[PDB]
Amino acid sequence: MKTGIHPEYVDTTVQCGCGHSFTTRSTKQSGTIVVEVCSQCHPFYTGKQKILDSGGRVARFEKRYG
Amino acid sequence: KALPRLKQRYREEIREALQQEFNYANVMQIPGVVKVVVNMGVGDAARDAKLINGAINDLALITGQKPEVRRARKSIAQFKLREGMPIGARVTLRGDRMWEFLDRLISIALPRIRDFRGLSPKQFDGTGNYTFGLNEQSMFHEIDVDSIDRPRGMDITVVTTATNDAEGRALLRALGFPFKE
Amino acid sequence: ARLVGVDLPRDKRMEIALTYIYGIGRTRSNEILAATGIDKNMRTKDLTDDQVTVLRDYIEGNLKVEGDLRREVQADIRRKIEIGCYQGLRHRRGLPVRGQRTKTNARTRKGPKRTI
Amino acid sequence: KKGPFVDDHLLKKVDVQNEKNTKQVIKTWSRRSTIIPDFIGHTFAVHDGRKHVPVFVTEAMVGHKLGEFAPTRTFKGH
RNA sequence: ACACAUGCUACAAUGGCCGGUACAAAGGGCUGCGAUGCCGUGAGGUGGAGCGAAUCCUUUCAAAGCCGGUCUCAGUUCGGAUCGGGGUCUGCAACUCGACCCCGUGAAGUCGGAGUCGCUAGUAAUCGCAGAUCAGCAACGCUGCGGUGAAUACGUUCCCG
Numbered sequence: 001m002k003t004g005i006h007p008e009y010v011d012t013t014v015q016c017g018c019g020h021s022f023t024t025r026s027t028k029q030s031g032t033i034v035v036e037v038c039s040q041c042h043p044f045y046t047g048k049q050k051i052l053d054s055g056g057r058v059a060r061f062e063k064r065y066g
Numbered sequence: 067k068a069l070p071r072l073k074q075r076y077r078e079e080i081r082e083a084l085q086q087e088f089n090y091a092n093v094m095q096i097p098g099v100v101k102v103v104v105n106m107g108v109g110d111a112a113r114d115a116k117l118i119n120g121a122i123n124d125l126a127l128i129t130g131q132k133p134e135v136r137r138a139r140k141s142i143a144q145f146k147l148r149e150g151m152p153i154g155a156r157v158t159l160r161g162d163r164m165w166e167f168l169d170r171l172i173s174i175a176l177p178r179i180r181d182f183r184g185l186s187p188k189q190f191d192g193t194g195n196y197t198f199g200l201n202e203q204s205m206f207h208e209i210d211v212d213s214i215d216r217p218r219g220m221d222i223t224v225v226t227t228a229t230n231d232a233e234g235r236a237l238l239r240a241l242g243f244p245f246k247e
Numbered sequence: 248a249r250l251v252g253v254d255l256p257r258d259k260r261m262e263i264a265l266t267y268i269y270g271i272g273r274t275r276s277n278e279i280l281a282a283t284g285i286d287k288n289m290r291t292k293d294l295t296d297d298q299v300t301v302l303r304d305y306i307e308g309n310l311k312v313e314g315d316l317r318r319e320v321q322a323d324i325r326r327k328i329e330i331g332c333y334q335g336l337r338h339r340r341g342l343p344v345r346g347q348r349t350k351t352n353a354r355t356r357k358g359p360k361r362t363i
Numbered sequence: 364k365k366g367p368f369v370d371d372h373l374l375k376k377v378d379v380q381n382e383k384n385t386k387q388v389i390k391t392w393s394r395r396s397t398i399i400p401d402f403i404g405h406t407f408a409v410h411d412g413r414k415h416v417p418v419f420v421t422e423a424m425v426g427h428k429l430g431e432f433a434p435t436r437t438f439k440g441h
Numbered sequence: 442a443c444a445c446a447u448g449c450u451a452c453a454a455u456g457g458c459c460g461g462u463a464c465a466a467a468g469g470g471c472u473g474c475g476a477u478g479c480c481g482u483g484a485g486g487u488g489g490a491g492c493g494a495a496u497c498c499u500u501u502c503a504a505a506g507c508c509g510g511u512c513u514c515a516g517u518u519c520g521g522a523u524c525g526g527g528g529u530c531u532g533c534a535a536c537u538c539g540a541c542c543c544c545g546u547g548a549a550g551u552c553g554g555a556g557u558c559g560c561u562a563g564u565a566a567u568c569g570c571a572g573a574u575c576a577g578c579a580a581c582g583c584u585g586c587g588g589u590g591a592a593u594a595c596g597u598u599c600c601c602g
Contacts, residue, residue, distance in 0.1 A: 002132070005132045006126075006130055006131060006132055007126055007127055007130045008130070009130040014170075014173070014174065017296070017300055022169075022173055023071075024071065024166055024169060024170050025070075025162070025166040026166070026170060026208070027127045027128075027129065027130045027208050028207075028208055033174070033207050034296075035174060035207060036249065036296070036299070037173075037174065037177040037178055038173070039173055039242070041177060041244065042177075043182070043183055043184050043244065043246060046183065046314075047183065047184075047246065049315075050318075053315075053318075053319070054322075056423070057400065057422045057423075057425060060400070060425045060426055061400070063364060064364075064367070180252040180313065180314070181252075181313070181314040211254065259517095259518085260511085260512080260518075262518080263512090263517090263518050266518080269545080269546070270544090270545060270546090271544095271545075272544075272545060272546080272547090273458090273518075274482095274543085274544070274545090275544070275545075278482095288511075310544095311545090316525080316526090316545075316546080319525075319526080320524075320525045320526080320545095320546080321525095323525060323526075324524075324525075326423065329423075330421070330423050330424065330427075330432075331432055332427055332431060332432065332536085333431035333432075333434050333536065333537060334431075334536085336434055338524095340438075343523085344523090344524075345523095345524095345538095346536090346537070346538055347538095347579090348579095350443095351443095351444090351445090351446095353523095354549090355522060355523060355548065355549070356523075357442085360442095360443085361442060361443085362442080362443065362444080363442055363443055363444095364528080364529090368533085368534055368535090370534095371533095394536065394537075395534060395535095395536075396534085396536090397536095411537085427536070428535090428536040428537095429536075430536050430537065431536040431537055432536090433537095434537075435536095435537055436537080440442055440443095441442080
């Protein structure tokens with residue numbers, strides 16, 4: 001590592017809304033990150049919703065119900 | 067901290083389970099990340115002189131390294147190039163910088179991108195290296211969202227000791243990196 | 248502030264700050280801000296992250312947004328352009344779909360002008 | 364949506380067509396309804412006045428009235 | 442793919458949006474006009490008071506106006522075209538081709554080159570209302586009704602008849 005050219009590299013404490021907390025080295029001067037994302041990926045859920053999204057014959061039968 | 071967190075779990079769990087999955091029969095064949103290099107764009111060289119210092123600054127404070135400015139091998143005429151103009155810088159990460167960058171992006175950068183469905187498993191080379199595209203930026207909470215006029219994108223490469231490709235799929239699957247069949 | 252995926256401005260009221268998302272206009276702002284309980288007169292600088300939490304969970308739970316409407320509107324237009332409808336023919340040729348005037352006006356579908 | 368239009372001549376013909384499990388090209392006058400999903404699979408010779416165009420009916424056709432799977436106007440421009 | 446012509450909505454603060462409130466004229470009505478009430482968010486649904494109508498219905502009729510709050514000059518709380526979903530009504534039937542309502546969507550457009558048009562007082566300008574045709578409506582049209590309401594005319598040299 002060279003001395004003076006690299007930015008300061010500090011410990012941090014990352015917190016999400018649910019409180020699931022992370023401790024890392026980072027570049028932030030604040031020493032913390034107040035984030036809205038945790039290790040709760042929505043791809044698993046988003047993908048399911050997207051899969052669920054198609055199919056309209058049923059919807060048509062809906063309007064008529066008969 | 068003796069071990070970075072991703073490496074805290076890598077030094078026991080992913081290695082023991084990857085031996086479970088693949089019977090190499092020899093310890094120290096088991097595959098691990100070598101370097102994580104980050105691939106600075108631009109292409110505005112010749113067209114605009116000022117921005118590349120925007121990219122030097124950009125690579126820095128996403129991770130704390132001074133990106134080394136990488137320039138043109140040759141002047142190729144159509145896309146205005148000139149031998150020796152700066153066209154994007156890159157930063158090579160290895161060790162504590164590699165792992166702290168990885169865990170942070172993993173638990174920070176990947177979830178935020180709008181409509182971020184996943185990452186393709188297909189994007190390996192012949193030998194177990196994974197590269198994917200960050201089109202805009204401001205996936206990172208390191209960059210203040212009003213400091214940032216135009217979006218500078220980048221490539222991020224994970225380079226492993228994976229002699230195959232499903233080796234690297236298996237590592238980067240067990241390592242907390244997303245994918246989507 | 249930050250929300251469902253639209254970067255909110257500096258100084259806007261809430262019934263206008265909600266409007267900058269693809270699924271929300273003025274009336275949905277007047278019904279969302281009545282259901283959740285946030286004052287419509289609140290600026291975006293004065294917005295609370297817990298208000299982002301309750302508001303965000305409400306409007307991703309009981310209403311659809313950016314990716315759902317762009318993929319849904321796109322998937323329905325390409326739905327009627329695959330099956331061979333006459334409105335499919337209008338979306339093919341780049342013509343107005345509602346059967347309206349094509350002789351003089353409907354320039355917003357043909358677009359910029361070439362003159363022969 | 365009290366009751367959607369049904370094309371009673373085509374309705375009588377369609378029922379006969381699907382009771383016998385027989386599929387036949389149909390020269391049909393009717394431009395007005397694809398009423399039930401009972402019309403799925405039957406080939407309709409739609410009549411724009413001048414000739415009959417064969418149209419296969421699949422599951423996505425439900426809710427589109429029958430005539431304009433066949434267009435009535437022709438335009439090229441040059 | 443176009444080019445012309447008459448109109449309408451605009452490009453915002455003399456403005457937009459929410460709340461409260463005051464004032465018209467004329468008209469229209471039988472298999473028509475249809476109230477209170479109830480169901481809807483709203484087109485409307487259910488119901489039929491009462492009227493061939495200075496009486497009943499079109500609500501006691503308006504909108505611009507006034508009082509108040511908010512918006513702070515921005516492609517915006519301007520602008521509504523377009524497009525998606527969801528409806529209602531009329532009709533045997535709303536695909537080619539109806540109007541209206543709800544949710545979303547949110548484009549051009551920053552007062553407009555050469556030119557050119559209208560208008561001399563309740564006029565111009567702007568604001569709603571009714572009618573005929575009509576089951577429904579392409580009505581922003583046409584014919585009328587009223588509301589608020591200006592500037593300028595030195596004068597025949599010039600253009601037009």
